[PDB]
From a paper:
Sco GlgEI is a homolog of Mycobacteria tuberculosis (Mtb) GlgE. In Mtb, GlgE is part of a biosynthetic pathway that generates α-glucans from trehalose and is a genetically validated anti-TB target. GlgE enzymes polymerize maltose-1-phosphate (M1P) to linear α-(1→4) glucans, Figure 3A. In these studies, we used Sco GlgEI-V279S, which possesses the same active site topology and active site residues as Mtb GlgE; however, Sco GlgEI-V279S is more stable and is highly amenable to structural studies.
Residue numbers in the entry:
A (entry chain B), B (entry chain A): 15 to 663
Amino acid sequence: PTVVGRIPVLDVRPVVQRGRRPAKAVTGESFEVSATVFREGHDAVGANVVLRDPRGRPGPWTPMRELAPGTDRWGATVTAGETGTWSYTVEAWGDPVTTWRHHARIKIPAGLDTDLVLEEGARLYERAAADVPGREDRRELLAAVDALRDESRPAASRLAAALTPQVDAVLARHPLRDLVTSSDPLPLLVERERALYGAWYEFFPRSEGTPHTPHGTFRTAARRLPAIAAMGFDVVYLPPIHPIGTTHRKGRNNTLSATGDDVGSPWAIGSPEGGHDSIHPALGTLDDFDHFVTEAGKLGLEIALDFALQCSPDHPWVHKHPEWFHHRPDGTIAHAENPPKKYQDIYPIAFDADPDGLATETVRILRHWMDHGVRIFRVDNPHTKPVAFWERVIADINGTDPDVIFLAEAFTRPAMMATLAQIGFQQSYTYFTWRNTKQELTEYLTELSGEAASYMRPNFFANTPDILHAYLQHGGRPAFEVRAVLAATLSPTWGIYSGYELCENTPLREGSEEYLDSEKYQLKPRDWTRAAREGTTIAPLVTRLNTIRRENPALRQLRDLHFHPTDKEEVIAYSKRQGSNTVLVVVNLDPRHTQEATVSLDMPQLGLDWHESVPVRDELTGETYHWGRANYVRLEPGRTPAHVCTVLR
Amino acid sequence: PTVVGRIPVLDVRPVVQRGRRPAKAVTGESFEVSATVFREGHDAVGANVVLRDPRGRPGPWTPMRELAPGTDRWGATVTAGETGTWSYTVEAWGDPVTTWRHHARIKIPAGLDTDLVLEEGARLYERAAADVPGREDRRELLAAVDALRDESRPAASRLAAALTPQVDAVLARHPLRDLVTSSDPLPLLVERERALYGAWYEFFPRSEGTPHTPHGTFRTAARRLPAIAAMGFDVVYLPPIHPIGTTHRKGRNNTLSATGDDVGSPWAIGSPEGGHDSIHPALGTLDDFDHFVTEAGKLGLEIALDFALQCSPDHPWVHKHPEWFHHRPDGTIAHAENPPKKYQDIYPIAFDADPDGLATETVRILRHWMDHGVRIFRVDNPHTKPVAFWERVIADINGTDPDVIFLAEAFTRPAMMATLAQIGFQQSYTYFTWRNTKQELTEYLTELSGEAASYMRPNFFANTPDILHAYLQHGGRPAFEVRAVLAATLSPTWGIYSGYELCENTPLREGSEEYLDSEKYQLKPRDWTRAAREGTTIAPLVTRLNTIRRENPALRQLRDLHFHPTDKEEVIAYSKRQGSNTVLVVVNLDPRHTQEATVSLDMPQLGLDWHESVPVRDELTGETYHWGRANYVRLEPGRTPAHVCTVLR
Ligand SMILES: OCC1=C[C@H](NC2CCCCC2)[C@H](O)[C@@H](O)[C@@H]1O[C@H]1O[C@H](CO)[C@@H](O)[C@H](O)[C@H]1O
Ligand SMILES: OCC1=C[C@H](NC2CCCCC2)[C@H](O)[C@@H](O)[C@@H]1O[C@H]1O[C@H](CO)[C@@H](O)[C@H](O)[C@H]1O
């Protein structure tokens, strides 16, 4: 009982944890299945990929090619359809027609064994014809058999008849396959399209108040949705919406002690008004939330709720479930840290005393918000909770509600970010904000779209309430434009935190990535109408970007991405493709200085010969340009951060 | 039911084919088991490797360490004992005592929480005490427990009682391990030492004849073994010893037609005088072979036989089992090709008509030679036979006779060479002869001793009857010296084909790696006594080298090898280590010109601080040197090809 089959087929990728967790995909996504495929001796091998939908049904005949000569690595692109658990195998086989055609091309003109090789071809095309099921496809192949056998013709003419394109036609359709060897099935999990594609917008409802009641409510915040929808966003992510604690409530600018009307951080979940299943009374009731969810849905927006599995000391859990916390010998509970940060206002959950209780409560809490229209959750700080916990929770929820998308806010070491993705988290936050040079971007994106894409889906938020990167601080408005062009086109999921559009870039101090006067500890009213009137918002650019994404399916995917070399360190170029769609992007990473460069396009990667002109259209400017293997660009920051171009039919 | 455990243990290496084939080792070989290990939050993890011999017995406590900061990859070295099928797991755990000690060294001198931190520690040394079952070890920790709780002692003095190395012992002996998580078992296959370590000598028995009878016999050839054993070799590899066919027998110098007395290629196995189970009658009988095998053993030599699963057209199989061959439509059998080489004198075995029959006969043939003392098989050209055939045959033979070593002569693409190693082949031929620059050699060895060492064991033949590399052609005798030093110290198994020691370097043509007047097609008599008197043999160095290997266990293993930088392309340097043994080698790859260089030793890789003296002894000259972090060397071709140095304590 051998491990290797008749024709070796080994290391079928994609693979997640040696095959005991599923590789990932979404409806309509293309990705490449691959395998090492070879045989003993010198004869030709073929390989093909077999996709199975969740019922057993196989996909189209999908043949593979050797991906680089002499490597015996083969690949083919396959595409997932209906959501569910799929499977895929690679089949390998002896390819006798390629083997024979190769030998007949040398032996027949050399006059070697011409009578034997031609009868070999007759017998073998006859065999190819026994499986071809079309009467026309059959009779075509069998004519070549007779032409091979016609001794009244020169051998060169008899052989020629087995290589006419009408024979390659019938043969490409129904190939003759010897010694068919299958790999073991590998699991694929196909999820709804939002798992991979979508633009996210984060805002605090409490900041969208009125002059007479400054603390916003769901009813006042619902009026901010039209602006957000108009910018072309699909998901609206809310920070925790529940009662905020008062004990050790932080004051403005992350000061330890609050004051009389300091609002405190929404992540300090819990107070005697309720816990994670309740609404913060200054936002309104559970019906105010439904109104919000409904108004969001009407505009085409999906609500994503923040799940922070933690408590403020006033959460009812603190006394209702003391065993969900770790108490020091004096009975106090150390406040949470994500060092060097201190979270004095909240308690970390301990998991080893009553793991069943936390599991049951977590899914109850989540099913509660599920019942009210929440189908997406931004999981706060998952890497401080056990990995097997999220695995079990995501399984419970998805076993009944497979459409529920979880996003992992895991800024941490590469191991944990990867593991959390592989155990269930549909999307992941990334290091995107700390990749700002051409080389950092190229490296990270080469990886995220490389092998990582079989278990991770990146959500490129260009800012969060906790990350005001120095690139944006020092670059001003042209920095905010470049980073949005970058996030919206390098990932099929990107996002911004409210105030990005207004280019809010004042840090708490220098060397800090915190915001001065951070929204986390204060209401942050913003004059959206003034900013729009005065043109001091890049909301126009954010909108056209999500427009480009919605008209260009190349931008709705991640794995098909290629960087093109340019002769300036500050100028990056790259293209993505989906079928006939080819988007092509050139960004000036200098926020401060005009750059000009030669972008030397890798023409075959766009599907073109080395010398062809390319009709492109700069979807930001609407202008049209004619490019070739080398192209002069000039990008003036403030005027034009980048060209975002579709190739024209 | 989750995939990930409480404390994650992930991607445990070494692994072969996702765990469906065993990793390899030999009795007494050291190698590193490694794993990705981490946890949620900021407390410490520990991990250990649990190696199990074939009855289950677990090995010594083997704790692991993070291999680089922030990588979450952990490793520990394990050592194999008895032959058999072993298994190994990694356990990971929360390390609460390491976390507390970390907090106690910071908080206690600052005077922060001293009464709580000290009580946290007492309660926890109390917990380590419930697992120590000895009456004495318990009170040891409990005295630290009582001193930690001692209200009337200085805080610095209470902490000290939990940190005495007298307590570090009883804890390293019985560690407090929380939430112990295991990986699933991985299989390890431990083979006898000769599979990894040993020197080979290949020669043709028929070339050791008498003046009156030029075709040697086993009885005359047995007389050549004293020279071979004395040269320090362990294995004697004989080309096929069976009847040679006459149909299409090749003549001298690989000419297509023989003459009246051309002996033919020994690989043209088979005639009506017998096939693979029979002895070539010009060699003597099966009793002469017994005599030869027995006389070889007396000298400390093991016989390795060539197994070539193929036939001359006069083999009895050609008519007894036509189905083991591939027939053209007229019933003839195309002669074997390995393009561009043509082997007109032999037919390849075809495997798809009667695979059980070929298997049964194959293991029948091998058990015959096993019955006559042959426990090693050099499998000729395995990559022209199906991979699964070798898997099933090697499993079968080793299933009854686990000591039988197979060596695969597969010079081909890397995929095939890897798979044959992974399916059973104890040793592999390598690309060694085509790696002659410092960068080629370093690249290849970094690969062979890196991850490849978990499934392949290299046999560094510096020449074969089929590979006289141009390096040896153009370099002459100093080239032959350099490659022997290189082969004998870079691999624990190396070999030479007889005539190497006489520096036979005359090729078929320019641009060929074939031998002129190949022993493959003609008796090649050699005046061994004359060459030694005339000093035209490098047998002294071969002998010196094999002695150095036998006194220095660093040269009897493969994986511990490290390259040291030198400032001349032509001077390579490296060291190997096995326990206290450190061999350090500096070779001049220039065969024609004296090279001088500064060898800049990587002192930690030798186990020293950058300022230490290193007493070495040049095992080739007997000279003694005091070396350091940087060393000037001068190597003259002809006089000194290399330093091969042992370190002294
Ligand atoms: O829940 C903690 C939490 C985790 C998130 N993780 C960071 C760490 C890596 C860099 C970027 C994200 C973010 O801090 C943010 O979502 C959140 O913190 C906020 O809430 C706390 C509770 O009130 C306050 O104590 C704290 O000051 C305030 O910032
Ligand atoms: O057995 C096949 C074969 C393969 C081995 N593989 C080589 C080829 C690639 C580069 C170096 C290793 C070696 O050639 C050698 O063992 C063998 O060849 C010999 O056997 C044939 C049958 O008698 C003769 O026709 C031929 O003249 C003679 O040389």
